[PDB]
């Protein structure tokens, strides 16, 4: 049981830029680490094997080397087909162990989300519960969160999130989040709000509604 | 060379007591690449060393770039270190026209499974099963137990980074001994009855050099005047005694 | 070119089991180790097991010992994975992959994988709820109507609008697995806001694997 550490957890760069990603094993794995690319909906593809040997079918743009005890992958120039999650596999000693996967993003224009808040509907409330829904469309970059408030108080422990895939032409995506209240708690509050932010946004988008509205 | 070894089983060979045409592969173009480190690509025949090495092995094209005196890389640091106390040149031919075939080439077993790095100028052939895991293998393969030396599936259809190359390595040594190897030397034409600035086997002077009436033992090479001034030479190639006026 | 094709995916009840298989083509199994790797939604790759076809020897991840068994058949040129005593936590896409000898080499070629999901309800239709729009518009002058699809099984679920006729302006979120063992997601249609009173917006949740669908009308409310 040899564990994997990777860095950075994500990387963002433009087309033609140089990319370096590193992988570290907790024990010696010699030079039997392999790199793989994964795209959404697809199985991983071998990129580099036996630490530094490039796999046929992989562009010459890919290379790498060992420094000290760590192994570094380098993309000399990113092309659109090189944006993938990058994994390391240690096959030297069993069990075969994989790292988390480093996400590489294509640099795109940064933008604020379009925020749509849907107050609990009459039909939703028939369950005896309430669910406040905030949907954030078409924004960029990938690291983002939905911050919820009830009567201007910050909420915690009562929310859920789901995130979609990024668009191949502009890398935008959307977040979806909710607040769970019993109907009885919903009825005791007056003001609800959704504050949305992300790593590239200097001005969070704020939307709100009154209890019972819509 | 007719035959090459794997890199791990580096075919180490020393060259001594001779004339080595070091630049022969620069000019012949029988190898795809001729890259020199500390010595010149050409006019390499002008280098006199006590010994030189002339080693031969088969590696991948990307590994050909990795091997150089004093340099690092997976192949350079683990299977064979080429030291920088020596100067040298790494020369390689594309062996798709010799070694590659479908099924691979089993005369070239490369070390994959190791506990440590091999030393400068160190050759090895061990077949002992390698322990990757926690328990001894005792000669048996299995998960976490491996055969240390393996063949590559070198084929005519692989790209250059993986294609095999026949690599010959030139390495130049100086030790506390008389030198025994250098490249070929070139003489100029001999002119006798004219003033010439002469150099015979390292001995110099200016004069007119004509046939002598002196005799000498097969042993002897030069005649001498007061205070050891040369007054005769025998030609190094022509067996005539020549008087220096 | 070499190929690996997974099959035998499906649904499992908690405490139950499923057997997966993968066929090889373009190469034999002998001389190769066959491996299975799982990837739960939201997770990275986790190795489960490997078998050396010319050996009969196997290796397993500690995380699957006592539950997963790996085997292979060189006459059929196939690999197998027997997955026992499964939980909702075990939902994942299970992939077959090839590597050389007994390891020390990475995997090269991978199959594409098949989904296995574990739940107490082999089939379940969703309760689909409408989501009333905010009356305040966004950039571009748009607004949206939407729905929530809750407690259904199995995933994947396809969501579209106007009983399947509306794809234009349709945006959906991926489903996630809840504590109920069932799945849920949200969906909207974004148009210039005046179109929300012109076009038909019925949330169409399609469940081909259980031969059903849910049709829920969504419309503007006073805000
Ligand atoms: C390694 O093989 C290469 C092949 O390219 C050798 O180069 C070639 O060596 C031959 C020797 O037979 C040369 O032929 C000679 O040509 C000269 C004039 O060109 C002629 O006077 C001789 O009678 C003889 O035919 C040939 O020219 C030469 N090719 C090139 C392109 O230079 C090389 O010598 C070999 N090296 C060793 C160490 O064996
Ligand atoms: C160094 O090499 C030269 C070649 O350039 C050698 O000279 C050659 O010596 C041979 C043997 O004497 C000669 O063959 C015979 O020579 C005699 C008289 O020259 C002639 O009558 C015969 O018909 C026959 O050719 C050869 O001609 C001669 N070549 C030249 C250009 O002189 C020389 O002996 C070598 N020196 C040493 C120390 O080995």
XYZ file of N, CA, C and O in Angstrom, chain B residues 86-216:
524
model
N 36.744 11.845 -18.299
C 37.060 11.408 -19.641
C 36.355 12.351 -20.606
O 35.281 12.871 -20.297
N 36.909 12.554 -21.784
C 36.163 13.343 -22.774
C 35.534 12.325 -23.706
O 35.896 11.154 -23.643
N 34.608 12.692 -24.581
C 34.088 11.610 -25.426
C 33.104 12.050 -26.493
O 32.909 13.252 -26.679
N 32.515 11.062 -27.214
C 31.590 11.295 -28.331
C 30.637 10.080 -28.445
O 31.040 8.912 -28.325
N 29.345 10.359 -28.614
C 28.329 9.307 -28.699
C 27.744 9.308 -30.110
O 27.164 10.304 -30.562
N 27.921 8.187 -30.800
C 27.575 8.078 -32.210
C 26.508 6.985 -32.453
O 26.653 5.859 -31.975
N 25.426 7.277 -33.201
C 24.386 6.235 -33.346
C 23.758 6.047 -34.745
O 23.484 7.003 -35.478
N 23.516 4.762 -35.078
C 22.855 4.271 -36.312
C 21.443 3.726 -36.078
O 21.192 3.029 -35.098
N 20.521 3.979 -37.009
C 19.143 3.497 -36.883
C 19.043 2.007 -37.245
O 19.161 1.594 -38.412
N 18.776 1.181 -36.240
C 18.853 -0.249 -36.424
C 17.554 -0.879 -36.876
O 17.412 -2.111 -36.899
N 16.625 -0.061 -37.384
C 15.441 -0.654 -37.989
C 15.853 -1.462 -39.210
O 15.125 -2.342 -39.663
N 17.030 -1.164 -39.763
C 17.497 -1.880 -40.933
C 18.395 -3.070 -40.561
O 19.005 -3.682 -41.439
N 18.505 -3.371 -39.255
C 19.340 -4.462 -38.757
C 18.700 -5.338 -37.660
O 18.661 -6.564 -37.783
N 18.288 -4.706 -36.550
C 17.803 -5.416 -35.360
C 16.283 -5.552 -35.211
O 15.808 -6.502 -34.583
N 15.523 -4.573 -35.705
C 14.066 -4.558 -35.490
C 13.313 -5.648 -36.243
O 13.658 -5.990 -37.376
N 12.255 -6.173 -35.617
C 11.397 -7.175 -36.243
C 10.113 -7.364 -35.455
O 10.069 -7.116 -34.248
N 9.095 -7.917 -36.087
C 7.892 -8.192 -35.331
C 8.186 -9.327 -34.363
O 8.736 -10.356 -34.747
N 7.812 -9.111 -33.103
C 8.050 -10.035 -32.003
C 9.147 -9.517 -31.065
O 9.229 -9.945 -29.912
N 9.947 -8.552 -31.527
C 11.009 -7.951 -30.716
C 12.364 -8.632 -30.852
O 12.510 -9.660 -31.515
N 13.375 -8.058 -30.192
C 14.739 -8.584 -30.311
C 15.318 -8.954 -28.940
O 15.622 -8.116 -28.086
N 15.488 -10.245 -28.748
C 15.814 -10.821 -27.456
C 17.290 -10.926 -27.166
O 17.697 -11.563 -26.196
N 18.103 -10.274 -27.994
C 19.531 -10.250 -27.750
C 19.858 -8.981 -26.982
O 21.009 -8.745 -26.611
N 18.831 -8.181 -26.694
C 19.036 -6.923 -26.011
C 18.179 -6.785 -24.772
O 17.119 -6.161 -24.821
N 18.611 -7.386 -23.671
C 17.797 -7.350 -22.468
C 18.280 -6.212 -21.567
O 19.429 -6.195 -21.103
N 17.388 -5.246 -21.378
C 17.589 -3.991 -20.664
C 17.152 -4.098 -19.206
O 16.080 -4.636 -18.918
N 17.949 -3.577 -18.277
C 17.525 -3.681 -16.883
C 16.410 -2.702 -16.553
O 16.548 -1.479 -16.721
N 15.327 -3.282 -16.037
C 14.130 -2.575 -15.617
C 13.915 -2.609 -14.110
O 13.459 -1.629 -13.517
N 14.230 -3.750 -13.492
C 13.911 -3.913 -12.067
C 15.134 -3.957 -11.167
O 15.826 -4.978 -11.105
N 15.371 -2.851 -10.457
C 16.580 -2.625 -9.665
C 16.369 -2.100 -8.261
O 15.324 -1.525 -7.946
N 17.400 -2.275 -7.434
C 17.442 -1.714 -6.093
C 18.374 -0.500 -6.056
O 18.256 0.356 -5.178
N 19.320 -0.439 -7.001
C 20.325 0.612 -7.031
C 20.868 0.862 -8.437
O 20.649 0.074 -9.364
N 21.573 1.986 -8.561
C 22.265 2.469 -9.757
C 23.592 1.753 -10.033
O 24.351 1.506 -9.092
N 23.938 1.513 -11.310
C 25.293 1.028 -11.604
C 26.265 2.201 -11.733
O 25.886 3.324 -12.075
N 27.524 1.900 -11.440
C 28.672 2.805 -11.451
C 29.235 3.190 -12.842
O 28.802 2.666 -13.888
N 30.093 4.240 -12.908
C 30.820 4.614 -14.098
C 31.604 3.428 -14.591
O 32.312 2.788 -13.815
N 31.495 3.162 -15.881
C 32.159 2.018 -16.517
C 31.800 0.642 -15.939
O 32.536 -0.323 -16.164
N 30.659 0.520 -15.253
C 30.267 -0.775 -14.713
C 29.284 -1.536 -15.595
O 28.214 -1.039 -15.939
N 29.663 -2.767 -15.931
C 28.872 -3.695 -16.739
C 28.242 -4.770 -15.871
O 28.910 -5.298 -14.982
N 26.996 -5.142 -16.166
C 26.373 -6.266 -15.465
C 25.380 -7.058 -16.311
O 24.869 -6.572 -17.317
N 25.183 -8.319 -15.919
C 24.239 -9.236 -16.543
C 23.290 -9.997 -15.588
O 22.746 -11.018 -16.006
N 23.106 -9.584 -14.323
C 22.299 -10.412 -13.416
C 20.855 -10.656 -13.823
O 20.144 -9.756 -14.269
N 20.427 -11.906 -13.611
C 19.090 -12.406 -13.906
C 18.275 -12.737 -12.649
O 17.221 -13.369 -12.736
N 18.798 -12.383 -11.475
C 18.129 -12.695 -10.203
C 16.760 -12.023 -10.114
O 16.669 -10.808 -10.278
N 15.724 -12.778 -9.711
C 14.378 -12.202 -9.633
C 14.311 -11.143 -8.549
O 14.679 -11.371 -7.393
N 13.799 -9.995 -8.964
C 13.674 -8.784 -8.197
C 12.492 -8.709 -7.285
O 11.365 -8.955 -7.707
N 12.746 -8.290 -6.057
C 11.702 -8.110 -5.076
C 11.200 -6.681 -5.036
O 11.921 -5.772 -4.627
N 9.953 -6.488 -5.467
C 9.342 -5.165 -5.459
C 8.568 -5.008 -4.159
O 8.427 -3.908 -3.618
N 8.087 -6.151 -3.655
C 7.257 -6.195 -2.455
C 8.030 -6.494 -1.175
O 9.219 -6.194 -1.053
N 7.314 -7.029 -0.180
C 7.855 -7.304 1.149
C 8.488 -8.684 1.383
O 9.204 -8.860 2.373
N 8.262 -9.657 0.498
C 8.784 -10.998 0.738
C 9.780 -11.414 -0.336
O 9.633 -11.010 -1.488
N 10.736 -12.316 -0.032
C 11.717 -12.836 -0.966
C 11.018 -13.627 -2.058
O 10.046 -14.331 -1.768
N 11.568 -13.558 -3.291
C 11.033 -14.213 -4.484
C 11.639 -15.598 -4.672
O 11.012 -16.496 -5.236
N 12.882 -15.767 -4.241
C 13.596 -17.036 -4.349
C 13.610 -17.605 -5.770
O 13.474 -18.811 -5.968
N 13.780 -16.736 -6.763
C 13.844 -17.170 -8.153
C 12.494 -17.329 -8.863
O 12.463 -17.714 -10.034
N 11.384 -17.006 -8.203
C 10.081 -17.182 -8.825
C 9.350 -15.867 -9.107
O 9.183 -15.045 -8.213
N 8.894 -15.707 -10.354
C 8.139 -14.529 -10.793
C 6.714 -14.570 -10.247
O 6.157 -15.647 -10.019
N 6.118 -13.401 -10.067
C 4.764 -13.303 -9.545
C 4.428 -11.849 -9.308
O 5.184 -10.961 -9.700
N 3.298 -11.564 -8.694
C 3.043 -10.159 -8.466
C 4.074 -9.766 -7.435
O 4.321 -10.524 -6.500
N 4.688 -8.602 -7.620
C 5.772 -8.090 -6.778
C 7.136 -8.857 -6.870
O 8.033 -8.593 -6.041
N 7.308 -9.749 -7.905
C 8.532 -10.512 -8.242
C 8.778 -10.474 -9.762
O 7.982 -10.992 -10.565
N 9.933 -9.922 -10.167
C 10.156 -9.726 -11.606
C 11.484 -10.174 -12.206
O 12.538 -10.125 -11.573
N 11.454 -10.564 -13.482
C 12.707 -10.864 -14.164
C 13.337 -9.514 -14.528
O 12.710 -8.721 -15.238
N 14.552 -9.199 -14.050
C 15.174 -7.897 -14.182
C 15.580 -7.378 -15.551
O 15.613 -6.154 -15.723
N 15.833 -8.263 -16.529
C 16.320 -7.832 -17.846
C 15.339 -8.178 -18.955
O 15.082 -9.348 -19.227
N 14.812 -7.183 -19.655
C 13.816 -7.531 -20.663
C 13.998 -6.916 -22.046
O 14.570 -5.834 -22.213
N 13.527 -7.679 -23.028
C 13.499 -7.348 -24.450
C 12.487 -6.285 -24.823
O 11.376 -6.248 -24.283
N 12.835 -5.444 -25.784
C 11.890 -4.482 -26.308
C 11.351 -4.948 -27.644
O 12.104 -5.471 -28.487
N 10.065 -4.647 -27.861
C 9.328 -4.909 -29.100
C 9.667 -3.893 -30.186
O 8.784 -3.185 -30.704
N 10.952 -3.851 -30.530
C 11.476 -2.952 -31.530
C 11.042 -3.460 -32.880
O 11.299 -4.620 -33.207
N 10.380 -2.593 -33.638
C 9.796 -2.887 -34.931
C 10.070 -1.730 -35.902
O 10.183 -0.584 -35.456
N 10.097 -1.980 -37.225
C 10.241 -1.000 -38.300
C 9.151 0.076 -38.316
O 9.307 1.111 -38.963
N 8.035 -0.194 -37.642
C 6.890 0.692 -37.592
C 6.824 1.615 -36.370
O 5.868 2.385 -36.236
N 7.812 1.555 -35.478
C 7.791 2.422 -34.297
C 8.413 3.781 -34.639
O 9.201 3.866 -35.580
N 8.078 4.842 -33.886
C 8.685 6.161 -34.125
C 10.082 6.238 -33.514
O 10.402 5.432 -32.632
N 10.829 7.301 -33.836
C 12.236 7.455 -33.430
C 12.520 7.382 -31.960
O 13.557 6.861 -31.558
N 11.672 7.953 -31.137
C 11.976 7.906 -29.722
C 12.098 6.464 -29.214
O 12.919 6.184 -28.331
N 11.310 5.530 -29.790
C 11.329 4.134 -29.375
C 12.213 3.254 -30.265
O 12.673 2.195 -29.838
N 12.437 3.665 -31.510
C 13.242 2.865 -32.423
C 14.598 2.633 -31.785
O 15.097 3.509 -31.070
N 15.194 1.447 -31.966
C 16.502 1.099 -31.480
C 17.581 1.755 -32.301
O 17.432 1.898 -33.521
N 18.674 2.048 -31.650
C 19.872 2.541 -32.260
C 21.103 1.800 -31.802
O 21.256 1.466 -30.620
N 22.007 1.602 -32.742
C 23.302 1.014 -32.483
C 24.245 2.115 -32.139
O 24.573 2.976 -32.958
N 24.646 2.120 -30.883
C 25.419 3.205 -30.369
C 26.805 2.766 -30.007
O 27.018 1.737 -29.353
N 27.752 3.534 -30.482
C 29.133 3.298 -30.175
C 29.619 4.504 -29.399
O 29.284 5.653 -29.721
N 30.339 4.245 -28.325
C 30.798 5.335 -27.486
C 32.290 5.423 -27.384
O 32.997 4.472 -27.033
N 32.756 6.611 -27.698
C 34.144 6.959 -27.658
C 34.439 7.708 -26.374
O 33.786 8.708 -26.057
N 35.422 7.226 -25.632
C 35.799 7.867 -24.372
C 37.315 7.934 -24.250
O 38.024 6.959 -24.480
N 37.816 9.124 -23.973
C 39.245 9.412 -23.956
C 39.841 9.566 -22.548
O 39.452 10.464 -21.788
N 40.801 8.683 -22.209
C 41.445 8.586 -20.889
C 42.909 9.033 -20.817
O 43.709 8.741 -21.722
N 43.256 9.704 -19.706
C 44.646 10.032 -19.399
C 45.022 9.493 -18.018
O 44.436 9.895 -17.011
N 46.014 8.610 -17.968
C 46.484 8.044 -16.693
C 47.989 8.202 -16.624
O 48.624 8.586 -17.607
N 48.579 7.869 -15.482
C 50.025 7.965 -15.292
C 50.788 6.831 -15.989
O 51.370 5.947 -15.360
N 50.784 6.894 -17.312
C 51.395 5.914 -18.193
C 51.765 6.616 -19.501
O 51.254 7.707 -19.751
N 52.715 6.108 -20.298
C 53.032 6.625 -21.605
C 51.806 6.488 -22.455
O 51.060 5.523 -22.289
N 51.568 7.427 -23.349
C 50.382 7.274 -24.153
C 50.551 6.203 -25.202
O 51.615 6.111 -25.812
N 49.485 5.420 -25.464
C 49.606 4.411 -26.495
C 48.666 4.604 -27.703
O 48.788 3.843 -28.675
N 47.684 5.529 -27.646
C 46.790 5.688 -28.800
C 46.624 7.148 -29.227
O 46.563 8.040 -28.373
N 46.499 7.370 -30.550
C 46.246 8.688 -31.135
C 45.638 8.428 -32.499
O 45.449 7.266 -32.884
N 45.319 9.480 -33.223
C 44.782 9.310 -34.549
C 45.936 9.232 -35.531
O 47.099 9.220 -35.115
N 45.650 9.097 -36.827
C 46.618 9.058 -37.900
C 47.263 10.412 -38.062
O 46.615 11.436 -37.853
N 48.508 10.413 -38.503
C 49.240 11.639 -38.769
C 49.475 11.817 -40.255
O 49.550 10.839 -41.000
N 49.607 13.063 -40.694
C 49.855 13.320 -42.103
C 51.142 14.084 -42.316
O 51.328 15.174 -41.778
N 52.012 13.496 -43.123
C 53.309 14.068 -43.470
C 53.149 15.032 -44.633
O 52.209 14.897 -45.425
N 54.080 15.971 -44.768
C 54.086 16.835 -45.942
C 55.119 16.226 -46.895
O 55.809 15.266 -46.528
N 55.189 16.719 -48.129
C 56.119 16.163 -49.113
C 57.563 16.527 -48.825
O 57.852 17.647 -48.414
N 58.480 15.596 -49.082
C 59.883 15.885 -48.833
C 60.606 16.549 -50.003
O 60.629 16.041 -51.123
N 61.219 17.681 -49.692
C 62.021 18.505 -50.566
C 63.404 18.501 -49.960
O 63.551 18.756 -48.769
N 64.404 18.186 -50.763
C 65.765 18.075 -50.264
C 66.684 19.296 -50.453
O 67.085 19.956 -49.485
N 67.000 19.670 -51.694
C 68.008 20.727 -51.865
C 67.464 22.170 -51.891
O 67.679 22.910 -52.852
N 66.757 22.542 -50.828
C 66.154 23.867 -50.618
C 66.179 24.158 -49.122
O 66.149 23.190 -48.363
N 66.195 25.454 -48.658
C 66.027 25.731 -47.223
C 64.571 25.478 -46.814
O 63.616 26.016 -47.395
N 64.446 24.647 -45.808
C 63.180 24.219 -45.280
C 63.160 24.277 -43.767
O 64.170 24.006 -43.104
N 62.009 24.651 -43.223
C 61.816 24.581 -41.788
C 61.343 23.141 -41.537
O 60.227 22.769 -41.923
N 62.238 22.307 -41.009
C 61.996 20.878 -40.835
C 61.545 20.466 -39.446
O 61.975 21.038 -38.439
N 60.731 19.402 -39.414
C 60.271 18.723 -38.206
C 60.209 17.195 -38.404
O 59.278 16.677 -39.028
N 61.212 16.483 -37.900
C 61.268 15.028 -38.042
C 61.036 14.360 -36.710
O 61.860 14.476 -35.806
N 59.885 13.728 -36.548
C 59.535 13.078 -35.285
C 59.660 14.028 -34.087
O 60.091 13.616 -33.009
N 59.292 15.291 -34.263
C 59.363 16.272 -33.185
C 60.689 17.047 -33.081
O 60.786 17.980 -32.280
N 61.694 16.710 -33.891
C 62.982 17.403 -33.823
C 63.060 18.416 -34.949
O 62.833 18.090 -36.118
N 63.366 19.665 -34.605
C 63.322 20.722 -35.600
C 64.604 21.499 -35.848
O 65.536 21.494 -35.038
N 64.593 22.223 -36.973
C 65.672 23.129 -37.379
C 65.491 23.627 -38.818
O 64.615 23.150 -39.539
N 66.321 24.587 -39.243
C 66.197 25.111 -40.610
C 67.465 24.863 -41.417
O 68.575 25.255 -41.015
N 67.276 24.242 -42.576
C 68.406 23.888 -43.423
C 68.037 23.192 -44.706
O 66.869 23.114 -45.087
N 69.072 22.732 -45.383
C 69.007 22.061 -46.666
C 69.298 20.593 -46.387
O 70.269 20.285 -45.696
N 68.425 19.683 -46.809
C 68.607 18.298 -46.417
C 68.882 17.405 -47.614
O 67.997 17.182 -48.430
N 70.083 16.847 -47.699
C 70.440 16.044 -48.879
C 71.027 14.698 -48.497
O 71.325 14.449 -47.333
N 71.224 13.818 -49.460
C 71.748 12.502 -49.120
C 73.094 12.572 -48.417
O 74.004 13.298 -48.832
N 73.193 11.790 -47.347
C 74.364 11.670 -46.498
C 75.212 10.470 -46.848
O 74.714 9.469 -47.363
N 76.500 10.563 -46.545
C 77.423 9.453 -46.717
C 77.695 8.731 -45.394
O 78.633 7.937 -45.289
N 76.864 9.011 -44.395
C 76.959 8.400 -43.083
C 76.229 7.069 -43.047
O 75.288 6.839 -43.803
N 76.683 6.191 -42.167
C 76.065 4.894 -41.953
C 75.558 4.844 -40.530
O 76.052 5.580 -39.675
N 74.564 4.007 -40.272
C 74.024 3.923 -38.928
C 73.474 2.537 -38.651
O 73.226 1.756 -39.576
